[PDB]
Amino acid sequence: ELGWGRHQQYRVRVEDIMVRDVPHVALSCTFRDLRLALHRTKGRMLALVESPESMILLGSIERSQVVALLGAQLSPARVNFSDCKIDPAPFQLVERTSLHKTHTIFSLLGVDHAYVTSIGRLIGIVTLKELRKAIEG
């Protein structure tokens, strides 16, 4: 784990290594946006946004409740996550941030992943894999 070693990584900041692609989902009717997200992406989590070009984020959504929403459209009958749940407004990270803060947002304190952010903006999602990758290089 981080810190002690030859000194060079004391320099590095979150923008220098964070992955730029976007598991976002729009606050709109289209199950096609959901289908495309579920096709293109995998793992625990997605982000919910006001619109693709405004890029304000509300919170996080996970594969089971969205494939169950698709399941609700699939049900024998003839998008609104607020009918069930939408999860906590998480931490965020600002582009300049040094690793020695970011380590103490996921540890000594329990959180799994973080959205990198700017004023009203979503830049991407960080995970422990990028983090421990960045610690080691």
Add this chain to the structure above:
Amino acid sequence: ELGWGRHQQYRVRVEDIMVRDVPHVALSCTFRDLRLALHRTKGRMLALVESPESMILLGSIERSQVVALLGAQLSPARVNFSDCKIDPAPFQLVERTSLHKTHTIFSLLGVDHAYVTSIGRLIGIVTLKELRKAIEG
């Protein structure tokens, strides 16, 4: 101090100790209401919002930036908060949180103030005065 022994910090939550009138400001062009935020409440850092009908916590501004913006707008001559220094809501709170969780995010980061958000729409504000009261009452 943290409290070792007989406590009800596990009984009671951020929703109980909440305070709700706040120095918030719209993204709007007019300065006629910015005049209120100068004295209608007392405090250092304000709550910038995406709309008086949405109240997403876009970020925070110190009085010395906004008073200088008014000093320029009423300079001897015959909106633009956008190019002052701004910071997004650095951490945010949700009603079901017990006092102990809050104490750790305050103390571990040296953050002086925080906002309650639920998902998006603000509910109220917190400072070192509220907790240093409520941990004894």
